Ligand binder design. Structure first.
Ligand SMILES: CN(C)[C@@H]1C(O)=C(C(N)=O)C(=O)[C@@]2(O)C(O)=C3C(=O)c4c(O)cccc4[C@@](C)(O)[C@H]3C[C@@H]12
Ligand SMILES: [K+]
Ligand SMILES: [K+]
Ligand SMILES: [K+]
Ligand SMILES: [K+]
Ligand SMILES: [K+]
Ligand SMILES: [K+]
Ligand SMILES: [K+]
Ligand SMILES: [Mg+2]
Ligand SMILES: [Mg+2]
Ligand SMILES: [Mg+2]
Ligand SMILES: [Mg+2]
Ligand SMILES: [Mg+2]
Ligand SMILES: [Mg+2]
Ligand SMILES: [Mg+2]
Ligand SMILES: [Mg+2]
Ligand SMILES: [Mg+2]
Ligand SMILES: [Mg+2]
Ligand SMILES: [Mg+2]
Ligand SMILES: [Mg+2]
Ligand SMILES: [Mg+2]
Ligand SMILES: [Mg+2]
Ligand SMILES: [Mg+2]
Ligand SMILES: [Mg+2]
Ligand SMILES: [Mg+2]
Ligand SMILES: [Mg+2]
Ligand SMILES: [Mg+2]
Ligand SMILES: [Mg+2]
Ligand SMILES: [Mg+2]
Ligand SMILES: [Mg+2]
Ligand SMILES: [Mg+2]
Ligand SMILES: [Mg+2]
Ligand SMILES: [Mg+2]
Ligand SMILES: [Mg+2]
Lengths: 129, 88, 154, 179
RNA sequence: CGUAAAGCGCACGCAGGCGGUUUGUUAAGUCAGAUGUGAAAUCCCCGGGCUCAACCUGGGAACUGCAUCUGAUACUGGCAA
RNA sequence: GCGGCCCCCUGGACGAAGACUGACGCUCAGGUGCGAAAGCGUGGGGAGCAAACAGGAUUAGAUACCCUGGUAGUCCACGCCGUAAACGAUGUCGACUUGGAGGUUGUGCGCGUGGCUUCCGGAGCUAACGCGUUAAGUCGACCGCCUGGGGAGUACGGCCGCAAGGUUAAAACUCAAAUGAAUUGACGGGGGCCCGCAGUCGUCAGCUCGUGUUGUGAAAUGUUGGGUUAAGUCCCGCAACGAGCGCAACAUGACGUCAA
């Protein structure tokens, strides 16, 4: 059964980029939208939008630069079978700072850089580069 | 399998209406009716292993629905097993 | 271009008469400034094999975006059974790598690096894994470019 | 322009079973199991293929392909010899033998004193062009892979009538570009 | 873990692990801060003393831990709908 | 695993259009059940076939293969056994990711849309072979299992079994390999096509190289293929393009083989 919707979102992006899809759609959730917001603000995806009400669908517009997909890697870190939490000092650097780690903190989902500047740890959702 | 008429009776007794085929009580009552009916079949046909696998699926499904109902509403659970004459 | 001979190997094919020995030569060439290529040459004699390898290496060079004679970030490279890891290091570290990886990194112009070869250490595949690792390494500028940000934002 | 393209029959693709899925962007639709090419992609991609061919040949270029001789250019119209570009150092000796004293005339007569019709058919030539870093300008039909092609031109390239339109245009544009 | 060693012959299923989506609540996990403790020696850093060194030695850092208190509430858990 | 036809009892799957329940789910150590063939127990049955066995051949021998026979068994009822290359040598569930050609089974208006299934192939993956929307691709959940070849799936102990045996499962000791896939040869009581009165092989028509291209690589291609020739002779095709030594032409013995 479906036991990790976030890993599914990341995979839809990974597989979408590898297949040169313009957009990818999926069942929405508040956490998926929170992650989509971070990906947009850091410039990994172009745009997102939620459509529906009873069964909302999240669409992500993927971005390509010089033919190549911009999301070169995207990996689930914390997962249902093994949750991963880090203190502020132990927050991971992705690609020596050139990538992002998405972190769920008590002040919402944000990048590792924003968590570190806010002085927060949290759950490491995924690495993006 | 259970007849259209026998099914429709069970939906009337245990359901909220004729349309209420989905409720846990109805589902459990329907499974119970077919489990009880098939006792006669397997008394005669002891080596019908293939059909017995279908019976044991009915038994397992009933067990899972009863466990769901027990933790959702103990009182409805208690009423149901009394009406159908189940141990648990 | 600096040129380095990594490995020479005697290979054999059988014929009616007996065995026909020949030689293979694996070489790397580089400008010492983020340009590197490898070549693999085969001949009946060792010096001919090396010459063929060096000619191949010069025409099959790729560009690597260096930083101060070290890497931009940790990189993984894979080819066949060879899996390599390479990490940026501080000045005065030197090339902390095995011989095949060392030859590549030296001619490429990587002075400081920590490396490790996992799996097969077969030179032919280690060199391909290493160059594969280097060529897909991102600089901050291209990251900034693809993400549509400034480098200070990155 | 577009009216004269479909007049010739640029729009007619191969049958749907023979298609390359990479050509899906350029395909407009299908009728009786035959893909129809969108000429609204052809027009700008063709006209921009003329523009870069204007730019290269203005730098004293060598367009390799009646149309070639009209433009003072080189051609291969029989069997492409494997290694004609990548093994040029050897193939020159056959050129040398062709002009020291009909077999080499068929094979090398068009390039004796040295643009793709059908990219799938001329896959060897495109591969050689890619190896040496030579910009390919190919007509790509629905059954064909456009990955090697630098300047894709989505269109028919089986009918001589469609071919004469394309070959006329490139020979026209470059000749006026050199005068 | 197709063929190198490695998918139970197949299934049902208790314990266990895991759990779609929304709101509220809780604050167990998690996170933050503070306080107490974490012997000295050792290791490490900057110094000092034996002609130097080993060795001896001043102060620091470290001891990644544990406990308690006060907060945060995104995520996981509990509870309610 | 299941194959004539008919009836009786009965399990599952799939589709259409709704209605209903409201996370009731996925996986599953231990547990429990089912589980080919052979085999075992009791009672039946026994045409054909056939372990054992007997005779006849074959052979140096022939406890075989071949022949003539032939008992258990193969069949039925009930009970046991619990294993097979029980195989897709590929655990179950869910999501995602270009195409082509079929089979089978529903269903809506030539054109759609479901289920199951077969072949080819793209990216990707893979040591390679290959796999490729029925993944061996990209991910997540849970389980099972591996850790050099042997010794050994053996011993001991436990459990199970009427027995045969099954299951769980070591150690000492011993070796520097064992192994997988693929490559070039050679070889075959493999296949196709040809030739010869059927120092050496052999006057046999072969043997190679450069450059290019393919493969991670050994290597491959060229030299294969369609014809034709005494001839790699020649022609035509062809990721090869050329060249050398042989052939031929003007007795002549290619590269090599046998530490001859
Ligand atoms: C200590 N430990 C409990 C060991 C163990 O882990 C075993 C295992 N299979 O994993 C045993 O078999 C182990 O438990 C065990 O049973 C052992 C043995 O039976 C024997 C016997 O019987 C004779 C010689 C040697 C052994 C042995 C060395 O293999 C014993 C090892 C035992
Ligand atoms: K909570
Ligand atoms: K369970
Ligand atoms: K008998
Ligand atoms: K291969
Ligand atoms: K399992
Ligand atoms: K051993
Ligand atoms: K060659
Ligand atoms: Mg190569
Ligand atoms: Mg190894
Ligand atoms: Mg084996
Ligand atoms: Mg095996
Ligand atoms: Mg299996
Ligand atoms: Mg199950
Ligand atoms: Mg949840
Ligand atoms: Mg707490
Ligand atoms: Mg201390
Ligand atoms: Mg909650
Ligand atoms: Mg039997
Ligand atoms: Mg018997
Ligand atoms: Mg007989
Ligand atoms: Mg016999
Ligand atoms: Mg077994
Ligand atoms: Mg079988
Ligand atoms: Mg089979
Ligand atoms: Mg098996
Ligand atoms: Mg089936
Ligand atoms: Mg396939
Ligand atoms: Mg045993
Ligand atoms: Mg035993
Ligand atoms: Mg030969
Ligand atoms: Mg010749
Ligand atoms: Mg040929
Ligand atoms: Mg002669």
């Amino acid at each position: 059964s479906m036991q990790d919707p976030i890993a599914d979102m990341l995979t839809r992006i990974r597989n979408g980029q590898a297949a040169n899809k313009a957009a990818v759609t999926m069942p929405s959730s508040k956490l998926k939208v929170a992650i989509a917001n971070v990906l947009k603000e850091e410039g990994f995806i172009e745009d997102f939008k939620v459509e529906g009400d009873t069964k909302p669908e999240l669409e992500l517009t993927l971005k390509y630069f010089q033919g190549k997909a911009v999301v070169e890697s995207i990996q689930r870190v914390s997962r249902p079978g093994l949750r991963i939490y880090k203190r502020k000092d132990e927050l991971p650097k992705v690609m020596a700072g050139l990538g992002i780690a998405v972190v769920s903190t008590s002040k919402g989902v944000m990048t590792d850089r924003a968590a570190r500047q806010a002085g927060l740890g949290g759950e490491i959702i995924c690495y993006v580069a | 399998s259970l007849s259209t008429e026998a099914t429709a009776k069970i939906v009337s007794e245990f359901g909220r209406d004729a349309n209420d085929t989905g409720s846990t009580e109805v589902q459990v009552a329907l499974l119970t009716a077919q489990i009880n009916h098939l006792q006669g079949h397997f008394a005669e046909h002891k080596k019908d292993h293939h059909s017995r696998r279908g019976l044991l699926r009915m038994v397992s499904q009933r067990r899972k629905l009863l466990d769901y109902l027990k933790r959702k509403d103990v009182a409805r659970y208690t009423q149901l097993i009394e009406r159908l004459g189940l141990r648990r | 271009l600096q040129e380095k001979l990594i490995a020479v190997n005697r290979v054999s094919k059988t014929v009616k008469g007996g065995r026909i020995f020949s030689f293979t030569a694996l070489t790397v060439v580089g400008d010492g400034n983020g340009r590197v290529g490898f070549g693999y040459g085969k001949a009946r004699e060792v010096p001919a094999a090396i010459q063929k390898a060096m000619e191949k290496a010069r025409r099959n060079m790729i560009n690597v975006a260096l930083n101060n004679g070290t890497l931009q970030h940790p990189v993984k490279g894979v080819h066949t059974g060879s899996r390599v890891f390479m990490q940026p290091a501080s000045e005065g570290t030197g090339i902390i790598a095995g011989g095949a990886m060392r030859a590549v990194l030296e001619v490429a112009g990587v002075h400081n690096v920590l490396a490790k070869a996992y799996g097969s250490t077969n030179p032919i595949n280690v060199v391909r894994a290493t160059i594969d690792g280097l060529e897909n390494m991102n600089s901050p500028e291209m990251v900034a470019a693809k993400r549509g940000k400034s480098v200070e934002e990155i | 322009s577009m009216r004269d393209m479909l007049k010739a029959g640029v729009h007619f693709g191969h049958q749907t079973r023979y298609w390359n899925p990479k050509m899906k962007p350029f395909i407009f639709g299908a009728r009786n199991k035959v893909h129809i090419i969108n000429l609204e992609k052809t027009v700008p991609m063709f006209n921009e293929a003329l523009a870069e061919l204007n730019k290269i040949a203005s730098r004293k270029g060598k367009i390799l392909f009646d149309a070639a001789l009209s433009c003072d250019q080189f051609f291969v119209n029989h069997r492409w010899l494997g290694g004609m570009l990548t093994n040029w150092k050897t193939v020159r000796q056959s050129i040398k033998r062709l002009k020291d004293l009909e077999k080499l005339e068929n094979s090398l007569g068009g390039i004796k004193d040295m643009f793709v019709i059908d990219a799938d058919h001329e896959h060897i030539a495109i591969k050689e062009a890619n190896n040496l870093g030579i910009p390919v300008f190919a007509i790509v039909d629905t059954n064909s892979d456009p990955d090697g092609v630098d300047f894709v031109i989505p269109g028919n390239d089986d009918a001589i009538r469609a071919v004469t339109l394309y070959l006329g245009a490139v020979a026209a544009t470059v000749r006026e570009g050199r005068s």
